[PDB]
Amino acid sequence: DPTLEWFLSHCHIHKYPSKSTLIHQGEKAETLYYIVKGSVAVLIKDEEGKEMILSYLNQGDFIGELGLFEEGQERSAWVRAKTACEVAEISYKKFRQLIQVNPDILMRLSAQMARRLQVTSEKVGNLAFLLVTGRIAQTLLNLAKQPDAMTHPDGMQIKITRQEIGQIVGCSRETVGRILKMLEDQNLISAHGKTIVVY
């Protein structure tokens, strides 16, 4: 749309190959990003290097916004390219001028921030209230209802590794393996290889 086209005209755009890191946790934040094309993962880590995926973000999503509103902040998480990405970037200083010219661009950003708070708060609830089986079940269901799901005779077919599931729900790949076997035993899914059919 015209508002995003205008905003993007003020950005400089860069390509990140798959698996490259756009944002490192702890970096001093002075830059806003916007995904023109591609997908990323937002990750945090514990003291042993275990990773949890806080969110995937996709085309049309802003990234690196959390430092915009107060000076001297650090990046709160790592952001890694899941595919080749084309990403627009703009200094906080320039973005603030754009906001004065047309606050609709701040409305667009803030809308995403609000949704992220909602979704992350839901995740808190899931971790606090659900067991690992329930979190894995809900994750498989949510992934089957995503745009990139594949139609299957028996339901919706998804592509995700045990490692990635573990990183979403907070458990080892071995634990994912055991729970997935349990779910197939219950005739709720089938596991082919890296492919899972959610009935």
Add this chain to the structure above:
Amino acid sequence: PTLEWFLSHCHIHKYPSKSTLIHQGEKAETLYYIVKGSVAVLIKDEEGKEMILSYLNQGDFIGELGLFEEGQERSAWVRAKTACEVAEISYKKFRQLIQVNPDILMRLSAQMARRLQVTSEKVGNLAFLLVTGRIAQTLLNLAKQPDAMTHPDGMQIKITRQEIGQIVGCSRETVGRILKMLEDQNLISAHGKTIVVY
């Protein structure tokens, strides 16, 4: 100044302690601002167990999450801790104010950003730490707040075992047992409703 201006467009109401300002699932059409008092933001499970997502205080916006897209529900319960004086304004009126001076939206968004940082950390804590570790980190977090008092042995904080339980996801009895253990390990001290984090 800009706060004064914003408030002149609001209707201000009083809320006694324990009263619910916002109920989860209600249609969101209104923005609030805490002029005085403190609140807790809470979610519930299927068994009625409650978890505190955040405490908010004077200067905090509340009920902001439905502002940017129509037909959304309140995402959580917000309950008065102390009695509160709360400014209220329709989403429609607020959207007009933003066009006059977007600094009011910058202030609100600054809070959304902080909340996402905090809530994201909570996600990590729940995923990575056992109950003892979560209680420990909670004490550490409280010790960092502005309302924490300096003490010869560290920072003194004020919180109940029920509140800690609601924050970390465990019973008040579990909190009680673990605080005793943590004291034995020479990491904290306790006294009724007051805790010193070494």
